[PDB]
């Protein structure tokens, strides 16, 4: 009588009630055992997320889960005989809620305003843009943002004047040849894509003022 942690993906579709694991007492070899569960998610708030089949030991999930609401549950299993006597010590039941990509990346600002001097060499840091994602960035790529430049306005002298660091969001000059009198302002369409570039995209603007030498 011991149970391994239970792993359940959030936003599940059951069908409900969904069997998770069967609790079983070795003492059932001689008498009939009755199972029960207690704890937050079972008999205490949020009540009824989990239930157990009294006569079989089957642990049940009663609804879809939300990792960003509750990521983990700690419950207790109890095994009693018909005489009301406990046949086992309480069993710790851990239920881990695994992540789904249910949040889109969000830029901290719609417009980011930065500046750089006209006589700068390639590799010079311009400004740092930021995007956040509520999903998990540790065990999954759901919370992992990948930064990119979609377009540059204007394309004078050429389209690829700037670069953005894929993970930091730091904008850098990649080509020399900037001039305030020629082009004083650049409107960079910048993107943040979750799942490290394979998920959803969000767009913001980086406005770069070219300062006179």
């Amino acid at each position, epitope marked *: 009588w011991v149970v391994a942690p239970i792993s359940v993906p959030e936003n599940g579709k059951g069908p*409900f*009630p969904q069997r998770l694991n069967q609790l079983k007492s070795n003492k059932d070899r001689d008498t009939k055992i009755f199972y029960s569960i207690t704890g937050p998610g079972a*008999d205490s*708030p*949020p*009540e*009824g997320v989990f*239930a157990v*089949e*009294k*006569e*079989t030991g089957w642990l*049940l999930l*009663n*609804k879809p889960l939300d990792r960003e609401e509750i990521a983990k549950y700690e419950l207790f299993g109890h095994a009693v005989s018909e005489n009301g006597a406990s046949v086992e010590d309480p069993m710790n039941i851990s239920i881990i809620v695994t992540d789904q990509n249910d949040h889109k990346p969000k830029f901290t600002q719609d417009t980011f305003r930065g500046s750089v001097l006209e006589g700068v060499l390639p590799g010079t840091s311009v400004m740092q843009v930021t995007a956040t994602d509520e999903d998990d960035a540790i065990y999954t790529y759901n919370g992992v943002v990948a930064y990119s430049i979609h377009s540059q306005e204007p394309k004078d002298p050429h389209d690829l004047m700037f670069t953005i660091h894929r993970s930091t969001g730091t904008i850098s000059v990649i080509s020399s040849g900037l001039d305030r009198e020629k082009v004083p302002e650049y409107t960079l369409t910048i993107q943040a894509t979750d799942m490290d570039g394979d998920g959803s995209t969000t767009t913001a603007v980086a406005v770069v003022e070219i300062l006179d030498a």
Partner: antibody, heavy 123, light 107 residues
């Protein structure tokens, strides 16, 4: 003893919102030993639990998956009542709506019920 | 969800008769079952909970039995005020109800 008194309009037009209230006497909507429910009854689908609210350290709610996208159950502690709000109604929402008290979290059945409010969804 | 199926849909009985109503759950619910009595124009009335526990103030002529998937409500001696529709309800996974058994007067 505990009494539940229902109020609210019966006639709701299709795609419009159904709004009902349940007034409590002899108990508190904020009771730490009760849960407040809405249950409907139609000749077609029978008795159907819609959702509950209950107060412990804070407010909690649970909605039937069938109505989750259209339903709201809210307490009004000052008036000692709780409401039912069901958006975008269709003739399938035609039923007698009941408010009910479940001792604890409802795991001992529903002992106290309101009188019922007939809701007709028609144009 | 768990579906509750009652049997028969209606039955006819006389005053003083022993009446037996059945309820079947689509999956094992052990003892998480309540019984209700409902009269026309009225809200349901709780008779039994935990399959066999008589609700306070309910006459002793009402009794519940069964476990797992199969349940019974018994009225040991049918009284004139007992002619009504009886509903079973599970509370293992949320709250679902049976379709009812109407107990009518035999003549």
């Amino acid at each position: 003893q505990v009494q539940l008194q229902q109020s609210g309009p019966g006639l709701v037009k299709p795609s419009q919102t159904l709004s009902l209230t349940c007034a409590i006497s002899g108990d508190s909507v904020s009771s730490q030993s009760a849960a407040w429910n809405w249950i409907r009854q139609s000749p077609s689908r029978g008795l159907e639990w819609l959702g509950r609210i209950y107060y412990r350290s804070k407010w909690y709610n649970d909605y039937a998956l069938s109505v989750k996208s259209r339903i709201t159950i809210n307490p009004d502690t000052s008036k000692n009542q709780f409401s039912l709000q069901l958006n975008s109604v269709t003739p399938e929402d035609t039923a007698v709506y009941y408010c009910a008290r479940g001792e604890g979290y409802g795991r001992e059945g529903f002992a106290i019920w309101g009188q019922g409010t007939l809701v007709t969804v028609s144009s | 969800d768990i579906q509750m199926t009652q049997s028969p849909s209606s039955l006819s009985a006389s005053v003083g008769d022993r009446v037996t109503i059945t309820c079947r759950a689509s999956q094992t619910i052990s003892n998480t079952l309540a019984w209700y009595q409902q009269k026309p124009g009225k809200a349901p009335k709780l008779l039994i909970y935990a399959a066999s526990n008589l609700q306070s103030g309910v006459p002793s002529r009402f009794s519940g039995s069964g476990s797992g998937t199969d349940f019974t409500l018994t009225i040991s001696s049918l009284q004139p005020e007992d002619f009504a529709t009886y509903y079973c309800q599970q509370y293992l996974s949320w709250f679902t109800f049976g379709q009812g058994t109407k107990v009518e007067i035999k003549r």
